[PDB]
Design a protein around this ligand. Sequence first.
Ligand SMILES: OC[C@H]1O[C@H](OC[C@H]2O[C@H](O[C@]3(CO)O[C@H](CO)[C@@H](O)[C@@H]3O)[C@H](O)[C@@H](O)[C@@H]2O)[C@H](O)[C@@H](O)[C@H]1O
Ligand SMILES: OC[C@H]1O[C@H](OC[C@H]2O[C@H](O[C@]3(CO)O[C@H](CO)[C@@H](O)[C@@H]3O)[C@H](O)[C@@H](O)[C@@H]2O)[C@H](O)[C@@H](O)[C@H]1O
Ligand SMILES: OC[C@H]1O[C@H](OC[C@H]2O[C@H](O[C@]3(CO)O[C@H](CO)[C@@H](O)[C@@H]3O)[C@H](O)[C@@H](O)[C@@H]2O)[C@H](O)[C@@H](O)[C@H]1O
Ligand SMILES: OC[C@H]1O[C@H](OC[C@H]2O[C@H](O[C@]3(CO)O[C@H](CO)[C@@H](O)[C@@H]3O)[C@H](O)[C@@H](O)[C@@H]2O)[C@H](O)[C@@H](O)[C@H]1O
Ligand SMILES: OC[C@H]1O[C@H](OC[C@H]2O[C@H](O[C@]3(CO)O[C@H](CO)[C@@H](O)[C@@H]3O)[C@H](O)[C@@H](O)[C@@H]2O)[C@H](O)[C@@H](O)[C@H]1O
Ligand SMILES: OC[C@H]1O[C@H](OC[C@H]2O[C@H](O[C@]3(CO)O[C@H](CO)[C@@H](O)[C@@H]3O)[C@H](O)[C@@H](O)[C@@H]2O)[C@H](O)[C@@H](O)[C@H]1O
Ligand SMILES: OC[C@H]1O[C@H](OC[C@H]2O[C@H](O[C@]3(CO)O[C@H](CO)[C@@H](O)[C@@H]3O)[C@H](O)[C@@H](O)[C@@H]2O)[C@H](O)[C@@H](O)[C@H]1O
Ligand SMILES: OC[C@H]1O[C@H](OC[C@H]2O[C@H](O[C@]3(CO)O[C@H](CO)[C@@H](O)[C@@H]3O)[C@H](O)[C@@H](O)[C@@H]2O)[C@H](O)[C@@H](O)[C@H]1O
Ligand SMILES: OC[C@H]1O[C@H](OC[C@H]2O[C@H](O[C@]3(CO)O[C@H](CO)[C@@H](O)[C@@H]3O)[C@H](O)[C@@H](O)[C@@H]2O)[C@H](O)[C@@H](O)[C@H]1O
Ligand SMILES: OC[C@H]1O[C@H](OC[C@H]2O[C@H](O[C@]3(CO)O[C@H](CO)[C@@H](O)[C@@H]3O)[C@H](O)[C@@H](O)[C@@H]2O)[C@H](O)[C@@H](O)[C@H]1O
Ligand SMILES: OC[C@H]1O[C@H](OC[C@H]2O[C@H](O[C@]3(CO)O[C@H](CO)[C@@H](O)[C@@H]3O)[C@H](O)[C@@H](O)[C@@H]2O)[C@H](O)[C@@H](O)[C@H]1O
Ligand SMILES: OC[C@H]1O[C@H](OC[C@H]2O[C@H](O[C@]3(CO)O[C@H](CO)[C@@H](O)[C@@H]3O)[C@H](O)[C@@H](O)[C@@H]2O)[C@H](O)[C@@H](O)[C@H]1O
Ligand SMILES: OC[C@H]1O[C@H](OC[C@H]2O[C@H](O[C@]3(CO)O[C@H](CO)[C@@H](O)[C@@H]3O)[C@H](O)[C@@H](O)[C@@H]2O)[C@H](O)[C@@H](O)[C@H]1O
Ligand SMILES: OC[C@H]1O[C@H](OC[C@H]2O[C@H](O[C@]3(CO)O[C@H](CO)[C@@H](O)[C@@H]3O)[C@H](O)[C@@H](O)[C@@H]2O)[C@H](O)[C@@H](O)[C@H]1O
Ligand SMILES: OC[C@H]1O[C@H](OC[C@H]2O[C@H](O[C@]3(CO)O[C@H](CO)[C@@H](O)[C@@H]3O)[C@H](O)[C@@H](O)[C@@H]2O)[C@H](O)[C@@H](O)[C@H]1O
Ligand SMILES: OC[C@H]1O[C@H](OC[C@H]2O[C@H](O[C@]3(CO)O[C@H](CO)[C@@H](O)[C@@H]3O)[C@H](O)[C@@H](O)[C@@H]2O)[C@H](O)[C@@H](O)[C@H]1O
Ligand SMILES: OC[C@H]1O[C@H](OC[C@H]2O[C@H](O[C@]3(CO)O[C@H](CO)[C@@H](O)[C@@H]3O)[C@H](O)[C@@H](O)[C@@H]2O)[C@H](O)[C@@H](O)[C@H]1O
Ligand SMILES: OC[C@H]1O[C@H](OC[C@H]2O[C@H](O[C@]3(CO)O[C@H](CO)[C@@H](O)[C@@H]3O)[C@H](O)[C@@H](O)[C@@H]2O)[C@H](O)[C@@H](O)[C@H]1O
Ligand SMILES: OC[C@H]1O[C@H](O)[C@H](O)[C@@H](O)[C@H]1O
Ligand SMILES: OC[C@H]1O[C@H](O)[C@H](O)[C@@H](O)[C@H]1O
Ligand SMILES: [Ca+2]
Lengths: 150, 150, 150, 150, 150, 150, 150, 150
Amino acid sequence: MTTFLIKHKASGKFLHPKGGSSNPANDTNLVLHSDIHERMYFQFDVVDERWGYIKHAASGKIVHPLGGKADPPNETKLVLHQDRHDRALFAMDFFNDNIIHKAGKYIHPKGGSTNPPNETLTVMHGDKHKAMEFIFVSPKDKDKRVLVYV
Amino acid sequence: MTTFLIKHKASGKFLHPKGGSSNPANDTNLVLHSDIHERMYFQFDVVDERWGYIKHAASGKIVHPLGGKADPPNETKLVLHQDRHDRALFAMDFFNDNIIHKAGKYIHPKGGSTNPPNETLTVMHGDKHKAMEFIFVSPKDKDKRVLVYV
Amino acid sequence: MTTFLIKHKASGKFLHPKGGSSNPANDTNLVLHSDIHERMYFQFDVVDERWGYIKHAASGKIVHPLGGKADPPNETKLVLHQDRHDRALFAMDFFNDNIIHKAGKYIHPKGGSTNPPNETLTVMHGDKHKAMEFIFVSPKDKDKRVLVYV
Amino acid sequence: MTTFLIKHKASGKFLHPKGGSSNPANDTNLVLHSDIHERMYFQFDVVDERWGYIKHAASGKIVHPLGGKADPPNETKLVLHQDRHDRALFAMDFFNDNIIHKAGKYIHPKGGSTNPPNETLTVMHGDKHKAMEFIFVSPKDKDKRVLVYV
Amino acid sequence: MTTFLIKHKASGKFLHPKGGSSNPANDTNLVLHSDIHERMYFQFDVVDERWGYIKHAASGKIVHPLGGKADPPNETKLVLHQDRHDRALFAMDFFNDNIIHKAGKYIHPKGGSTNPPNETLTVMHGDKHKAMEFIFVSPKDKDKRVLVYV
Amino acid sequence: MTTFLIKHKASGKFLHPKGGSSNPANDTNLVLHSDIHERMYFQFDVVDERWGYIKHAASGKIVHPLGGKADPPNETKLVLHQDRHDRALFAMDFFNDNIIHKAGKYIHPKGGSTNPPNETLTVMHGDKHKAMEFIFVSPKDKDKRVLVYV
Amino acid sequence: MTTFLIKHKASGKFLHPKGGSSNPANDTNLVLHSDIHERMYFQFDVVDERWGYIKHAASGKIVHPLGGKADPPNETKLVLHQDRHDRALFAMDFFNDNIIHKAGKYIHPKGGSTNPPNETLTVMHGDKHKAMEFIFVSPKDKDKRVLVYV
Amino acid sequence: MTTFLIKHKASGKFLHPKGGSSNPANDTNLVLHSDIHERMYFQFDVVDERWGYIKHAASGKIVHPLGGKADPPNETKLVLHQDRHDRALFAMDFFNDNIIHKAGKYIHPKGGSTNPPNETLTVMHGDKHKAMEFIFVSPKDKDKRVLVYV
Ligand SMILES: OC[C@H]1O[C@H](OC[C@H]2O[C@H](O[C@]3(CO)O[C@H](CO)[C@@H](O)[C@@H]3O)[C@H](O)[C@@H](O)[C@@H]2O)[C@H](O)[C@@H](O)[C@H]1O
Ligand SMILES: OC[C@H]1O[C@H](OC[C@H]2O[C@H](O[C@]3(CO)O[C@H](CO)[C@@H](O)[C@@H]3O)[C@H](O)[C@@H](O)[C@@H]2O)[C@H](O)[C@@H](O)[C@H]1O
Ligand SMILES: OC[C@H]1O[C@H](OC[C@H]2O[C@H](O[C@]3(CO)O[C@H](CO)[C@@H](O)[C@@H]3O)[C@H](O)[C@@H](O)[C@@H]2O)[C@H](O)[C@@H](O)[C@H]1O
Ligand SMILES: OC[C@H]1O[C@H](OC[C@H]2O[C@H](O[C@]3(CO)O[C@H](CO)[C@@H](O)[C@@H]3O)[C@H](O)[C@@H](O)[C@@H]2O)[C@H](O)[C@@H](O)[C@H]1O
Ligand SMILES: OC[C@H]1O[C@H](OC[C@H]2O[C@H](O[C@]3(CO)O[C@H](CO)[C@@H](O)[C@@H]3O)[C@H](O)[C@@H](O)[C@@H]2O)[C@H](O)[C@@H](O)[C@H]1O
Ligand SMILES: OC[C@H]1O[C@H](OC[C@H]2O[C@H](O[C@]3(CO)O[C@H](CO)[C@@H](O)[C@@H]3O)[C@H](O)[C@@H](O)[C@@H]2O)[C@H](O)[C@@H](O)[C@H]1O
Ligand SMILES: OC[C@H]1O[C@H](OC[C@H]2O[C@H](O[C@]3(CO)O[C@H](CO)[C@@H](O)[C@@H]3O)[C@H](O)[C@@H](O)[C@@H]2O)[C@H](O)[C@@H](O)[C@H]1O
Ligand SMILES: OC[C@H]1O[C@H](OC[C@H]2O[C@H](O[C@]3(CO)O[C@H](CO)[C@@H](O)[C@@H]3O)[C@H](O)[C@@H](O)[C@@H]2O)[C@H](O)[C@@H](O)[C@H]1O
Ligand SMILES: OC[C@H]1O[C@H](OC[C@H]2O[C@H](O[C@]3(CO)O[C@H](CO)[C@@H](O)[C@@H]3O)[C@H](O)[C@@H](O)[C@@H]2O)[C@H](O)[C@@H](O)[C@H]1O
Ligand SMILES: OC[C@H]1O[C@H](OC[C@H]2O[C@H](O[C@]3(CO)O[C@H](CO)[C@@H](O)[C@@H]3O)[C@H](O)[C@@H](O)[C@@H]2O)[C@H](O)[C@@H](O)[C@H]1O
Ligand SMILES: OC[C@H]1O[C@H](OC[C@H]2O[C@H](O[C@]3(CO)O[C@H](CO)[C@@H](O)[C@@H]3O)[C@H](O)[C@@H](O)[C@@H]2O)[C@H](O)[C@@H](O)[C@H]1O
Ligand SMILES: OC[C@H]1O[C@H](OC[C@H]2O[C@H](O[C@]3(CO)O[C@H](CO)[C@@H](O)[C@@H]3O)[C@H](O)[C@@H](O)[C@@H]2O)[C@H](O)[C@@H](O)[C@H]1O
Ligand SMILES: OC[C@H]1O[C@H](OC[C@H]2O[C@H](O[C@]3(CO)O[C@H](CO)[C@@H](O)[C@@H]3O)[C@H](O)[C@@H](O)[C@@H]2O)[C@H](O)[C@@H](O)[C@H]1O
Ligand SMILES: OC[C@H]1O[C@H](OC[C@H]2O[C@H](O[C@]3(CO)O[C@H](CO)[C@@H](O)[C@@H]3O)[C@H](O)[C@@H](O)[C@@H]2O)[C@H](O)[C@@H](O)[C@H]1O
Ligand SMILES: OC[C@H]1O[C@H](OC[C@H]2O[C@H](O[C@]3(CO)O[C@H](CO)[C@@H](O)[C@@H]3O)[C@H](O)[C@@H](O)[C@@H]2O)[C@H](O)[C@@H](O)[C@H]1O
Ligand SMILES: OC[C@H]1O[C@H](OC[C@H]2O[C@H](O[C@]3(CO)O[C@H](CO)[C@@H](O)[C@@H]3O)[C@H](O)[C@@H](O)[C@@H]2O)[C@H](O)[C@@H](O)[C@H]1O
Ligand SMILES: OC[C@H]1O[C@H](OC[C@H]2O[C@H](O[C@]3(CO)O[C@H](CO)[C@@H](O)[C@@H]3O)[C@H](O)[C@@H](O)[C@@H]2O)[C@H](O)[C@@H](O)[C@H]1O
Ligand SMILES: OC[C@H]1O[C@H](OC[C@H]2O[C@H](O[C@]3(CO)O[C@H](CO)[C@@H](O)[C@@H]3O)[C@H](O)[C@@H](O)[C@@H]2O)[C@H](O)[C@@H](O)[C@H]1O
Ligand SMILES: OC[C@H]1O[C@H](O)[C@H](O)[C@@H](O)[C@H]1O
Ligand SMILES: OC[C@H]1O[C@H](O)[C@H](O)[C@@H](O)[C@H]1O
Ligand SMILES: [Ca+2]
């Protein structure tokens, strides 16, 4: 119900749908971009305890591994899509500051840079480090963390 | 951009947010009113084939059954609300001239009159008849139908 | 812009040009056939709100009443022809699941059977019933309806 | 609003008020005990993102470091007290499975045993290890984790 | 005694009798279909360790290779028949997620597609891949696996 | 209910409690022995679909990884213990012919021999090969497989 | 391996399998009888502190509440059965001179007589009184108590 | 052989030799104290059915009524002594949770308090109540009852 920004901790860029559309088509990539606007706001819909759907606020589309596989390999691109199923389940780990897929991999910027340029893609990948950390912040204050499970 | 007016076919009144605000609050009632102006313009964002969100152009808020239930009972009030989810999915049936919710009920004027007075609320109701028919027309020509899926 | 199959709902057969050619000559009849291939893919080119041209993807030819009359009588054969004009305008009614001509008659299998055999001609006819119903589906998923007005 | 048990992961014992009362007096010690009953149910009242009050369901008393200091030293006993203030703020880290105080120390069984006996006190302590891990489970199923931030 | 749905893992469609009847005639072909209802529930009657009869719950008819041969060739259609005999013995391999006939071939969708359309026939075939995998799930929860050997 | 022998496929030895006791004490090691007698009979108590407890028939004690950890390391010795909990859950894979722990490792003879000598210990280990294969056979016929999920 | 007779204190009769067989069938009733012979000798196999299995020496079958329920109602018959599990756990209280089931009821002669006749059934019942008292004596000296916990 | 702590049930204190020596002098008093260490571990040497010697683990001395009389009166102090004879015979009643001497009196805290101070003497007394109850627990887990007769 409460919206938030998905902030790449190391760079301060944010998770965007590639193109900034309020109704991006299915299979649109999610990229990192510095801009802030209501078409990059997200919500989280809890399904089972920690697990839920990361939902693009403007369109209602949720985050999927491209292809919708249960255990996607490293470098699988992340995309938006209307389908709901248990292969698009993520947890918003606001204590270790990362986003983990049901199958155990994390959301990374493609290439692992602490300062990725605008339009940089995001991918699934199993490594843990400072460049795959994300924090969840208020649309009205990019430095104020908000609870995404409420 | 593809804007239209939601015209009650039998009376020629139009769907308005109650109060005519460019920024109606969440849970603002949708009423019928004779007036035409920018704050009663609508858009339609396709989600899944025929299904999508009916969006108030001035505010970006979309049409919901009050309470957001998947299968709202007859007389459930229709409101505007910022959330996007599957219980706010409608189809714009421009062949039978009605607006159908994902769960199979239609938008009606409350009371079912062919000539409802100004400020009459709209509600969900399962019946099909002449007084729940709507057509989708150009803001600049209230008699010209326009394609809302485009 | 969007490619689809025209599937006869009652039988699961599809609309084909007679002979299955990627360049059927002008006035080639349109028939029903069980086969699937890219020479039976169609597109829809919107002209005026609901009205547009039903286009054979492989040849660019569009659906016409044979003879190109504005108000064709019942049993008028449907053919492919390269010409674009007003008398070849149809609407794709995906709510009642039929194909309606500008003058108000519908596309039928000749004889009105729910299970017409392969090579059955198609004709214009004014009746509405289960055997003149068509749905518009993805070439890669004959059970998934797609939006043709896009 | 969601009621849960605070289960010490290594031993399977639970957090109790010392004495098991439905109205333990102010400054009653929190202990570990194997028993399950309504007087060891807890709730969590969110105050500011991750931070909130750990609330004894039966009495409404919340968890405090004894003395209520902002930055309590190691071995500070944990007690129940009715007062609400910022020195009683905790986070329920359900990803690393621990309970952290606003000043950065964690809830431990006194002595750090993986199998603390019934009546063992709990204390603030800065170390992180397997014996200070807690999970938050359903009262009707001690192995089913539940979301405490809802 | 345990009722389940036979879900094609790759597509999420289910095994149906062709036509969906509660009493399909002998030699009715088994197909894949997305629908769920009481006439696609199955049971498994153990005969000899892993081997038994796959039984259509509504009719009591069991799965046979068409013609009832002991060692059916690839592409042999699967049908329902009331007879019980050794050539209708199958095992429900819930570890590798497939259905194996006594003679060593597996149940496949005809053509081996990961997304077979509704009414796709099923056939015996010797290949093993992700297009011939099936899981056995609860009639009330299509994602919950159930034990069929009881 | 059905009692069976757990036979090491490569050698024909069986899983015994080290000592052949009808009531072996807690933490008694599970070793391979050629002998057959009622004190090496096992049962399987289903808990959740494929998962259950491997139970020593004579004593009612079940198989545990030594230490009872959820994710035991390679070479962890498997022993008998009277406790029931979700870290002693196994599956009896009679299609691939192995015994898998809830955390994904398999029961092996210590050392991985196709011909393990009497009193060879058994351990958890993640590798898959011919020397860790087991089949489940009738006490009255060591070559007749029996269904353990019954 | 300590063998004993279960002597009804008030009458001096003994617990027998109905029929006196060295191999009583599963679900054979346990009755009181005056006779002494090796086919009414019992053993006790400690499982958890005070709790264990009461074992018929000649057959290895143990005492069960008929039906094997965890909390059997009053008048539930006691039988012999080969299965080992938690619902067949008893304690031999040689201080208060009774036999208590894990769920808290005691072994009684059916009807509660201080002098029940031969072939009197035994049942579970919650009452404590003189007629449900039993002592555990040497087979070779019916007045010498022996310690059954060994 | 089994080693245990003698725990006063009402207070949670334990039986100690006065002063806690690993070799108490003969006739050293037995007292209650809250400390746990190896100089207050006990064992039970079974002599005749329920009767045996309560042996101090550290010294091998056993519990005696001071004076070694067969029928000690109320308030007779309990001491440790090396002598082994029948006037030092006790039974460990783990069903009624008490320690009874062969002449029929019980071990009590002197004064019968539910919560006696450290160094409270123990005496013989015929009374039965909550304050003379003891349980027998594991040296690694003061809450786990252990069977002292094996
Ligand atoms: O990416 C998330 C999406 O993954 C899966 O859907 C993939 C894709 O399937 C279909 O696309 C095509 C064309 O119709 O289908 C075949 C499947 O191999 C491909 O050639 C091609 O991508 C759908 O039409 C697409 O909308 C869809 O994105 C999964 O099934 C989805 O639920 C979703 O998780
Ligand atoms: O994309 C996510 C990934 O970004 C970083 O790695 C990018 C790197 O991936 C591949 O290089 C290798 C070899 O396959 O992968 C590891 C990282 O897992 C690198 O050490 C190694 O070069 C591509 O071949 C490269 O082109 C690309 O630069 C980051 O290091 C990873 O943790 C992860 O975030
Ligand atoms: O009606 C569309 C809207 O319905 C749901 O949100 C309803 C409403 O919830 C809150 O209002 C109250 C205040 O507690 O909450 C309950 C409903 O749970 C009502 O009794 C009362 O009005 C919020 O304050 C409102 O902003 C919110 O609109 C649903 O959750 C929404 O997604 C949407 O579908
Ligand atoms: O609000 C939309 C609704 O208006 C009319 O129905 C209002 C009507 O509903 C109920 O009356 C009944 C009972 O369901 O409805 C039918 C007619 O639909 C009547 O036989 C019966 O009175 C309420 O109890 C009444 O207060 C209220 O008058 C219209 O008829 C509906 O089709 C629909 O447009
Ligand atoms: O009309 C739709 C249909 O066109 C093509 O098939 C036409 C017809 O051709 C072949 O059958 C035969 C034998 O070659 O061809 C002549 C046509 O005059 C007939 O005498 C005879 O049936 C095809 O094998 C048949 O399927 C078909 O009936 C095209 O091949 C079809 O896919 C379909 O598009
Ligand atoms: O069938 C659709 C087509 O109808 C019209 O064109 C018909 C047809 O006319 C000419 O063919 C003939 C003979 O030359 O003329 C009559 C009709 O006037 C026909 O019986 C016969 O085939 C042309 O030579 C053909 O090209 C043409 O198809 C109309 O004008 C077209 O736009 C189109 O709608
Ligand atoms: O071709 C499409 C058409 O097929 C069926 O009608 C064929 C039918 O038409 C005429 O029969 C009658 C009598 O004039 O016309 C009406 C309209 O269909 C029929 O009720 C009646 O049989 C021809 O004279 C007949 O020879 C021919 O069989 C179908 O019934 C129509 O709905 C339509 O789909
Ligand atoms: O502190 C949590 C615990 O409180 C209650 O149990 C206390 C205590 O009860 C029994 O111990 C004794 C003696 O039997 O009973 C009184 C009651 O306070 C104690 O002074 C004394 O130790 C039990 O034997 C112990 O398990 C327990 O520690 C409550 O009943 C428990 O459920 C639990 O909430
Ligand atoms: O422990 C949590 C509690 O700490 C603070 O209150 C402590 C304590 O203060 C008073 O109790 C006494 C006796 O009057 O006062 C001193 C501390 O000043 C203590 O040694 C002693 O217990 C109150 O009467 C008690 O209610 C209170 O528990 C703090 O003020 C509370 O908000 C709370 O955090
Ligand atoms: O075969 C399994 C399937 O059987 C039933 O559905 C059959 C069919 O129903 C509809 O199609 C029609 C109209 O009733 O039925 C025949 C069957 O071939 C077709 O000619 C005609 O289109 C649906 O449109 C189809 O999806 C469906 O295949 C049953 O109702 C299903 O639940 C299922 O069990
Ligand atoms: O298909 C499973 C079925 O196979 C065997 O029976 C086949 C079938 O035999 C008869 O059907 C036909 C036509 O009458 O007979 C020939 C084969 O002889 C086939 O071309 C055709 O299907 C019977 O009329 C059917 O009842 C019967 O199903 C086998 O005997 C059955 O037990 C069963 O396994
Ligand atoms: O029906 C299930 C089957 O579907 C696919 O095979 C269909 C395919 O089989 C044959 O094609 C080849 C060439 O002989 O045979 C093998 C499979 O045996 C294929 O690799 C290869 O294409 C037929 O000749 C074709 O007409 C037919 O389309 C799938 O490949 C199989 O695994 C199985 O799932
Ligand atoms: O091996 C299966 C067994 O593992 C776990 O228990 C281990 C062990 O715990 C106790 O033994 C000791 C000493 O009493 O207790 C600690 C663990 O708390 C160990 O370091 C030490 O061995 C029991 O007395 C033993 O019986 C037990 O085997 C697990 O807790 C058990 O449920 C079971 O899975
Ligand atoms: O005991 C289970 C294990 O047995 C076999 O593997 C033994 C051991 O082999 C390798 O490790 C070495 C090298 O041979 O062997 C000893 C321990 O036995 C170690 O000092 C040394 O690293 C492998 O790396 C290990 O997997 C394994 O522990 C058998 O081959 C294994 O599959 C497994 O069954
Ligand atoms: O069999 C063990 C049982 O024997 C005696 O109870 C037998 C008693 O049971 C039923 O009568 C009642 C009422 O239905 O059940 C309670 C059980 O105590 C009795 O108060 C009451 O009579 C039978 O229908 C009666 O005929 C029969 O008298 C004995 O009372 C129990 O303590 C126990 O030893
Ligand atoms: O009697 C049982 C008791 O003996 C030992 O303690 C006796 C001892 O207590 C006091 O000494 C100290 C310090 O005050 O008290 C604790 C025990 O309460 C000891 O750690 C420490 O020495 C008295 O001051 C002494 O006069 C008296 O002899 C033993 O240490 C205890 O564990 C316990 O077994
Ligand atoms: O306390 C248990 C102890 O009692 C008996 O021994 C008592 C005591 O006797 C001797 O001590 C004296 C003096 O020599 O004798 C009287 C007892 O009659 C005491 O007042 C006095 O101390 C021995 O010298 C002591 O060693 C001995 O403890 C009994 O004989 C012992 O077996 C034992 O049960
Ligand atoms: O020492 C164990 C004993 O302690 C308590 O009794 C102490 C009590 O004993 C005598 O009091 C009387 C009368 O003289 O004797 C009985 C003994 O129970 C008491 O009811 C009564 O008061 C002493 O004369 C008293 O000074 C002394 O207080 C406890 O009551 C007993 O159960 C037992 O635990
Ligand atoms: O279903 C009731 C319905 O009856 C007629 O259709 C009227 O036109 C409507 O106003 C409504 O009252
Ligand atoms: O509860 C019934 C019970 O009543 C008394 O206690 C008798 O002594 C028993 O024989 C029995 O009949
Ligand atoms: Ca038949």
